[PDB]
Each structure stands twice: as C-alpha cells, then as structure tokens.
Design a binder for this molecule. Structure first.
Ligand SMILES: COc1c(O)cc2oc3cc4c(c(O)c3c(=O)c2c1CC=C(C)C)CCC(C)(C)O4
Ligand SMILES: COc1c(O)cc2oc3cc4c(c(O)c3c(=O)c2c1CC=C(C)C)CCC(C)(C)O4
Lengths: 116, 115, 115, 116
C-alpha cells in the first residue's frame, strides 16, 4: 500500500469519517488524469488507492473534499477542498502517508515518506 | 485591501520572503483564469492583489510556489506548491487574510475573515 | 516591542479576542516566576509585554488560557491551556512574535524571530 | 492502550524517532507527580505508557523533549519542548491519541479521543 490518506477533525477531536477524495496524475499533455478515488473509513483512513505497479513516477494531486464534510456537520467552512500536489517515486518507489488535519478555517497537510 | 497573503517559514522562524504566487478566479467554463500575482515582501506579506470593486463573489485559488522557495534554500520539499481554494464573499465583502506556514514536508493555511 | 503574541481562531476564521495569558521567566531555583501578562486585543494581538532592557536571556513560558476562550464560545476544548516554552536571546536581542492557532482539539504555535 | 503519542518530523517527512517524553499527573496538592515516560519507536510512536486501571481521572501533562531531538539533528530549535496539558477521563474512560508534528520553529499537537 504505497499511498494512504488519513484525515482528522480538529473540532471534535476525532477521525474525519466519510471524507471523499479524488486522486489525479498529470498526463504527458499537462492535463490531470483521474487516478483513483475513495472515502475515509471510520478510522479516518483511506487505504488501497493504488498498487506499487500502477503508482508510477509522476506528479499527483489529491483533492480532499473538506467542504462537504464540514457542510454535513452544519458548518460553512472557508476552503473548497484541501489539495496535496506532489512528485512521487522520482528516486524510485516510496510509501506515502498523507495526513490532513481539518478545521473550518484552517487545515494542514503533512507527508511521511518511507523507503519500502 | 480586501485580500492579503502572509507566508511563514517554520524551519527558520522567519517570514518567507520572495515567495511567488498566482491568484486565479473560477471562470463559468470551469477553468482557472489568472487574476493577480506577486512575491512576498520582506515581512512575508503580499498586499495590493486586488481592490474591492474587482473582488467580486466567486471561487478563487491562490497557488503558492512553495517548491521554488525550498529549492533556493537548498532543502528538498515534498509539495509542488500550496493551493488555497475558497469561495469569496458568500454574502458581501469581508477582508481576507490567508496565512500559510511552510515546512519542507508540511504546510498549514488559515484564513482570517474580518469586517 | 521585543515580544509579541498573536492568537487565531481556526473554528471562526477570526482573531482570538480577549484571550488571557501569563508570561513567566525561569528563576535559578528552577521554578517559574510570573513576569508579564495580558489579554489579546481585537486584532488578536498582545503587545507591550516587556521592553528590551528587562527582556534578558533566559527561559520563558507563555501560558495561553485557551480553555477559558473555548468555554466562552461554548465549545468543549481538549487542552487546559497552550504553553510556549523557549530560550530567549541565545546570542543577543531579536524581536519575537509567537503566533498560536487554536482549534478545540488542536493548536499550533510558531515563532517568527527577526532582526 | 488508553494513551498513545505519535510524533512526526515535518522537515524530513518522517516519523520522529527516539523522542523522549515524560508524563505527569496533577496531585491533590497542586504539584505535578511523575506518571510515566518513554521514547518514540521507529514508527514515531509511544505505546504502553499506562493502563486503563492506572489512568484515572485527572489533569495530565505530556512534555515532549523536542529540543534534544532537533539538537541531535544539528538544529537549534525555538522551543524547549512541546507540552500537552489536558483533563482525562472526566466523563468516564476514553482512549487518547496525542499527535505532535515538529518543525524547528513551530509545532502543532492534536488529540483524537475515542470512546472505548
Ligand atoms: C503560522 O503562525 C503564524 C505566524 O507565525 C504569524 C501570523 O501572522 C498573522 C498576521 C495577521 C493575520 C494572521 O492570520 C496571521 C497569522 O495567521 C499568522 C500565523 C498563523 C498562520 C498559520 C498557522 C498558517 C491576521 C491578522 C492580521 C492583523 C490581518 O495579520
Ligand atoms: C501531523 O500529520 C500527521 C501524520 O503525518 C500522521 C498522523 O498519524 C496518526 C495516526 C493515528 C491518529 C492520529 O491522530 C494521527 C495523527 O494525528 C497524524 C498526523 C497529524 C498530527 C498533527 C497535525 C500534530 C489517530 C488515530 C489512530 C488510529 C490512533 O492513529
């Protein structure tokens, strides 16, 4: 599992459950090609987006639909979504853990990249 | 000043100086039209992006070239850039301050929306 | 102004106004002696804490009463307070800006150290 | 495992390994009593600080020795340490995950509190 995403709610102190996200990969012609998508589980995690074979070198974008999440909780947040854009696997294969911590007017995102 | 951006450097405890960014507005065909751009000053701020007449409701994206900034300092960054995408003015003009705090493998962005 | 504190509210996208804090300095018997205190203004800043003569090298703690702030807004917070503990002036006076960003179950604090 | 701490380095994009921390509990007489201590593992985690029996209701403080960590990496950081002070178990037993994300001049800390 070379790409995993973990989302936390900073207002309730819990995993952010059922957060949708779409992953794109930049194609040869400079457009974003749809790569994978899913929702966070009850542990605030999304596993199985991809595999070591399919997760080739390139520039990827993960767009976390944070606004629907806040909206379903009765909150109007600032952001339309949270986006993480990064070059992956450029020095060979890595495992990427992307973590997003959400507040209605703020978010942060961090990557842990481990050599496996 | 209806839209201000402030960037900070969590590795050095300083403003992030000379950081380039573009601002786009969502156009009705759903693409991103360039709107305003600049570099951060020595206080890590970028002002004068727009005015209140021109800054109408809509979806705006600020794309901060964080990767060039880490490269000039000689430190491998993770992100290509930091994006902030938001709906402005939901019901009327407020002032927006967007602050980004940068680390090579992490960033946070916050909005302060005042009256 | 050698030491300034700024607090922000990530739930509401505003300054955190009226937030109380005390500043302590580490005394040679290793206890924490009160040094300065205040509340944030309407811009979420607290200035005038000390002056450059009085603000000598040493270990300082800023203890931000974040729990009272969340209680007045009616939202259960996790932390008792936020603490920022740092060695000042390692080699000479610099200006310090300590910014705290508050959420009920999270906070971040950053220092901007300038010349 | 009612209390777990996870520390990440935001400069290298990795777990923060071998970070020491001490946990105190506030005693009846308003002093901090030593409660537990340990170091983060290779996954940046510290498990086994306590047990459900010993982890009674009270105000706890976790002091993460972030400065030694930065120092061992050749960096002079701002903070002496990162401290998390909180009331635990006041509405009955909970599981607390405390996460700290470290940069030399900044850190954040978040708690996830789950009912078990
Ligand atoms: C990241 O920590 C900081 C920080 O170190 C400095 C900051 O400075 C600010 C100045 C500011 C405003 C700000 O929001 C900030 C900050 O956000 C700020 C922050 C917090 C920014 C982040 C945690 C990404 C609003 C009020 C106004 C008077 C318009 O000017
Ligand atoms: C800071 O960014 C991260 C991060 O990169 C990894 C994180 O890992 C976590 C794992 C975790 C839990 C977590 O809260 C985290 C993280 O917080 C985490 C974070 C966010 C940490 C901060 C923004 C300080 C909760 C549930 C449980 C199932 C026990 O496992």
């Amino acid at each position: 599992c070379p790409l995993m995403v973990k989302v936390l709610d900073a207002v309730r102190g819990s995993p952010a459950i059922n957060v949708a996200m779409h992953v794109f990969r930049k194609a040869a012609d400079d457009t974003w090609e749809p790569f994978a998508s899913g929702k966070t589980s009850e542990s605030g995690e999304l596993h199985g987006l991809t595999t070591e074979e399919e997760f080739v070198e390139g520039i990827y974008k993960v767009e976390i639909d944070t606004k629907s999440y806040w909206k379903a909780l009765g909150i109007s947040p600032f952001h339309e979504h949270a986006e993480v854009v990064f070059t992956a696997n450029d020095s060979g294969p890595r495992r990427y853990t992307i973590a997003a911590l959400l507040s209605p007017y703020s978010y942060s995102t961090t990557a842990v990249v481990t050599n496996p």
